Subunit: 334 residues, 4 copies
């Protein structure tokens, strides 16, 4: 059954915990992979943790980096992981029928993204600008059988070319080049919402792009003080609810420490720095890191809306915690 | 197919052995988890052993405690366990369609129980009295699609608030607060019987509560000398057969050593100390520990009644043995 | 689909190799169980190797001995084995619907055989003569939904009571006590043949018993010089083809070394020591050990007859090799 | 659903990467098999890596060599491998219903190939010339329910007898002896193409044989300078596209180093040394080794043609990389 993704995003009052690997304690004696850049994606039946490896075990870009996956919450061991693809940069999602994965491998000056569908190579995209072809490093968004992704090529400290793609069963059917001067969109975190795709990216405040299934797009910055224009970096995410926005961020402004969720009822379009709700995901005394979003579709949840969820990488990579939104009572987590 | 649980409990003449992990011998060289608070629950297809971990392996409350599970009798290893939830206290059962799990995580003065259904967060209950929100640590009882649980909040040496809940597909639909002065109901072991729920709890003799699907309840103590009112502690269980009762207990009165089953034909309502049958589960020369009950429904057994079963934790935790009732000839086990 | 077992046994011209574990080399570094008394049994879908353990790993009667199993040819490791039952003596077979297992546990002077069906305890048999209740240590034979087994109780150096049982879905429905003075039937290896059960046992030459589904029985010795009456020991097997017999045996008469199959066209009823075909399974320079038979039913093979197969334990236990009959060209194995 | 294999071979413009085990880094600490002679074959649902073992783990002809398999890309560990057969030489393929495997075991002067179908022994072929019976060491080709293989018996430095077989459900139904003086066909790599079988073998330039389903055959050498007659060795492969040929080879002429694919539009029938496309699979500074082909049928890919793929063994054996053809843009791999 093909995923629809016509349903609006579910409203939430707070976030509750979903999963925690506990890999570092297990790998001190047992056999556990040293993982990097993990992300979570969900199918109609199960949620899984995808990660890039180097082939190294704990307590032991390159041609040897591969993409592997395990059931959410399981230890990423050589005896439980399922191979997906070869890549030093990768993304993945499910279209309701099978897994779609995208993996970039090859030369820095000639990288090729190999598109696989259900384990079979179906298509490839070659580096247009010949400068580190790279992708989302997160879940790709599927609406109506077709999946969408954002890919970049060029410099991480200047202006590089961006393209938005529409993929059907592993094939690229429609692509556009964005006209977005002075914008920087790396490591985009995307989710479906009422048949549209909304993405919040890393400006190396947060830029966003949104688009329809014909790849028509609009852009700007999240206006919230937590300018509607631009004001290094870390991957992150934000959810749009009308004019309100949920912004995930660290607690430190000089280091990647702590993590909190802030609800700003007018932050999408307003520039004020007022907010109503602040919940705590990670204490300021603990290291956090990169974060991103993923969703649980109605086909999986049994609900009439799309449930937003997110993950935080606790820094290679040591652990990956994740949370999902609820409309019931939840407390701050240290 | 939704579990019914209208069928009376099966009569038994004695108990026969079902399972034994043998984890300590295997973990001296291999990779085995250090487990705590195990319990057994059964679905229509399989029985599984649930346990709480700390993430530590053998021969190597907290934010890192998780609930995991393995097929009954298997070694609880990092390579075979299936993640369930995050909790320092937890319970679980199957409604005939999917798994329902309840897991309490967060602050001692602000704990939240996260209710999951088929891996998806569906609801949450927040600490009403702000004092160590805690649950059954056993199998929850499902009658007619809906599952029942007993949860407490307050002091373990005084009077705390109790609530009885009815959960449908992960949602709390009906709850009541018990009016039970001078009663103490911790770590309740519950089973379905003829559409009713019967629970025998820890008074820190044995108190019990029983209730219908509208959460109307009655209570008292097991009268058996093995008072109908009250006379520290350990989790345990007891089965009701009209006025007769099967009581599980240790052999020592000063220590948790040995284990025996005693059948008292008039013990539910009578105060005499006479019994007819005594079987031996654990020798007095061996350590025993916490115990509890679980059931095997007709949908699993092919029978016209519910088969009672129980487990004993052999003390963190080293091993978990279990037995089921039979009406055939069985001998004493040392 | 219930197994029929009406089909005669398949004729063979020689034996070809099926499986070999190679566990000793793998367990010198990895995690492998120390196994004892293995045997092979087949379901309509797969063949599996059953074994008894002590819970010990390599290169590290009792209450701790359990029955476990792995897919045929796989290493018997703690991470791949599936629990079956608790026993210091056990047998198993498949009825076409589920697994039936029989496991004897408890006191030497009060042993109970616990009958399980599809993981559920269904019945028990208690020691009639109170002397080491013990079973076949092989595959049990299923004809027409019902499975048959032979169990003994008493001395291994004198006369003990034997019983033949018919089990349906885990329940004992029909049993008989054999009147067999001066016969000794331990560790019987049984197979179905044209709706009848034929068993060749250990006399501690080879005695046999055969019976129908109403448990009517006949007995005698295999007459072959390789007397029709009696002439310590080892478990073994033999196949009946009219008046001809295939006898498995070691090559040494003073030690358990070597293994060969001998085809004697008139050996079932004749006392001569002439044979036509001798194939070699194990060289005389190698240790062999206990052996037994199992079968592959039409529901598994797609054939119109029952294919005979056998296994040899290479001596606790180090390795288990197995072979199946063919009508094509096969050579001697050293 | 029986595989058809009537569809022509898919045209390609270049090769993209599919899989890479990364076993050497994982086995330095964990439990990984020392593998030899790997090959890849695909079923309608999944692709798998088959290999021969000795039973030895990393960092620890014979009667102990077995054939085992794991999902493509997974580490070949004792805890994930699935047993197939006993052999010091073997081949395998899928007919659309089940797995067909062929395994040669026994004496150098009396070897027998045991044919298994779905785990059951169905037939055997005995050494006609009594000189190291040996097979393809690759995927066997299935067209229309029936599978084809090429087997040899005799000297590796002179003239030996060859036979072509047609196998249906594990049975040999049709075989022919080739009349091919001065030809040498060892370790043949075969693929289906438009209902015909085409094989390119090792001459210890490349000889080929092709045949129909009635086992009528034609032969010659690949004419390309990269003579139509003959001009030690290594296993390899080549794909035929009309008069054009894709030839895989190493970069060194004195050692097994590097790997490249060359497209010669007239190389099947022409003797010129001109080519149009050269892609790089392995750098000349890296060791390569044996290579071979396998295919992905329409039943697996969803396409209207057969997709060619190949593997390279990186030298016992350390790693196995594989690639599939695409018609999209792909770059050279170092
Ligand atoms: C969304 O799609 C489903 C499936 O086609 C349809 O039943 C439903 O009416 C649509 N509308 C929404 C937003 O639920
Ligand atoms: C969804 O896909 C179907 C099948 O291609 C198409 O007919 C339908 O119009 C699509 N809907 C949208 C929103 O594009
Ligand atoms: C119990 O429920 C089943 C299923 O609805 C029904 O067939 C049966 O009559 C009921 N009564 C009992 C106690 O068996
Ligand atoms: C069982 O559930 C069904 C469906 O909700 C309901 O109609 C029925 O009355 C329930 N029976 C009981 C015992 O509540
Ligand atoms: C055996 O049983 C099968 C299934 O009932 C039947 O079709 C067949 O005729 C019987 N006879 C034999 C010996 O094949
Ligand atoms: C086989 O079992 C069926 C069902 O019980 C019975 O009707 C039939 O007569 C049995 N046949 C034999 C050989 O007993
Ligand atoms: C190949 O076989 C399929 C299945 O029988 C058939 O539909 C098709 O027309 C045939 N022709 C080709 C070459 O596609
Ligand atoms: C394919 O097999 C079927 C069934 O045996 C047969 O009828 C058909 O003629 C075969 N086709 C070819 C190409 O041999």
């Amino acid at each position: 059954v093909k995923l629809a993704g016509n349903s609006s995003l579910c409203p939430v009052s707070g976030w509750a915990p979903l999963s925690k690997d506990n890999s570092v304690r297990i790998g001190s004696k047992g056999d556990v992979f040293v993982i990097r850049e993990p992300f979570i994606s969900c199918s109609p039946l199960e949620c899984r943790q995808f990660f890039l490896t180097q082939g190294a075990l704990l307590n032991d870009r390159s041609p040897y980096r591969t993409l592997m996956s395990v059931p959410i919450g399981s230890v990423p061991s050589p005896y439980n992981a399922r191979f997906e693809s070869i890549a030093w940069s990768a993304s993945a999602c499910h279209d309701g029928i099978n897994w779609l994965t995208i993996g970039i491998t090859g030369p820095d000056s000639g990288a090729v993204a190999i598109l696989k569908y259900n384990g079979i190579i179906t298509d490839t995209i070659k580096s247009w600008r010949n400068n580190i072809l790279r992708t989302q490093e997160s879940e790709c968004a599927c609406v109506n059988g077709s999946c969408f992704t954002i890919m970049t090529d060029g410099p991480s400290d200047g202006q590089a070319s961006y393209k938005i793609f529409r993929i059907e069963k592993g094939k690229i059917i429609k692509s556009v080049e964005m006209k977005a001067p002075n914008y920087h969109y790396e490591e985009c975190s995307c989710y479906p919402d009422s048949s549209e795709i909304t993405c919040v990216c890393r400006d190396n405040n947060r830029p966003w792009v949104s688009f329809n299934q014909n790849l028509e797009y609009q852009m700007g910055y999240i206006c919230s003080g937590v300018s509607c224009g631009p004001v290094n970096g870390v991957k992150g995410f934000s959810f749009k609810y009308g004019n309100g926005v949920w912004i995930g961020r660290t607690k430190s402004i000089s280091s990647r420490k702590g993590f909190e969720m802030i609800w700003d009822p007018n932050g999408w379009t307003g520039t004020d720095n007022k907010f109503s709700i602040k919940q705590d995901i990670v204490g300021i005394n603990e290291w956090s890191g990169y974060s991103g979003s993923f969703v649980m579709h109605p086909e999986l949840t049994g609900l009439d809306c799309i449930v937003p969820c997110f993950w935080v990488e606790l820094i290679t990579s040591g652990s990956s915690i994740s949370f999902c939104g609820v409309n019931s009572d939840t407390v701050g987590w240290s």
